[PDB]
């Protein structure tokens, strides 16, 4: 949420067309999907990450 | 003759599709039980009634165990 915010806030404030600002938010958000663990190929990664949340909540019992 | 046996084939593959929709909704039916469930729904009956039936009948074999 910070490198992406820098590239978005650069590519909106210099841009002089709506076609530029829309196509900047698009790549902003698709890079957020790539950097977060919600891609098609990183699914197993997420399914691993859920397992370390399991033993968190289990511990409170 | 010939179509009357391929029509029930056209029943089987739909019966296989519902075997996916059953397991992705985590239901207590198996493939034999669902066949009786389709025979129930073709004659016309509220499925809330059947669902309440199975929602009691399933709790009357593990409450005695």
């Amino acid at each position: 949420l910070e490198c992406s915010w820098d590239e978005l806030w650069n590519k909106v404030q210099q841009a002089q067309d709506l076609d530029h600002i829309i196509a900047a938010h698009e790549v902003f958000l698709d890079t957020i999907i790539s950097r977060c663990l919600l891609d098609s190929d990183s699914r197993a990664l997420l399914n691993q990450l859920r397992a370390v949340f399991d033993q968190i909540i289990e511990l409170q019992n | 003759a010939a179509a009357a046996a391929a029509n029930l084939n056209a029943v089987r593959e739909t019966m296989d599709v519902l075997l996916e929709i059953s397991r992705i909704l985590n239901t207590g039916l198996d493939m034999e039980t669902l066949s009786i469930c389709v025979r129930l729904c073709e004659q016309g009956i509220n499925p809330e009634a059947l669902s309440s039936v199975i929602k009691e009948l399933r709790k009357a074999t593990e409450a005695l165990k």
Binding site: I21, L29, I32, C36, L37, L38 | -
Partner: protein, 61 residues
């Protein structure tokens, strides 16, 4: 109005409202909850339902 958000614009705080997704008979409040930012005006041309769906996904993470 306990937090800082009271001092921002009435429009953007009005657009924050809660939402609930579709229920299941087996359910947990942590499983079905969302905040929905409303889109009013012609701003639909700038922001589509698909970017809302990805917004909801990263919010779930």
């Amino acid at each position: 109005r306990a937090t800082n958000a009271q001092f921002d614009s009435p429009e953007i705080l009005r657009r924050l409202d809660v939402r609930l997704l579709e229920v299941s008979p087996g359910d947990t409040g942590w499983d079905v909850f969302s905040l929905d930012y409303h889109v009013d005006g012609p701003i639909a041309t700038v922001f589509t339902r698909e970017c809302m769906s990805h917004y909801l996904r990263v919010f779930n993470f």
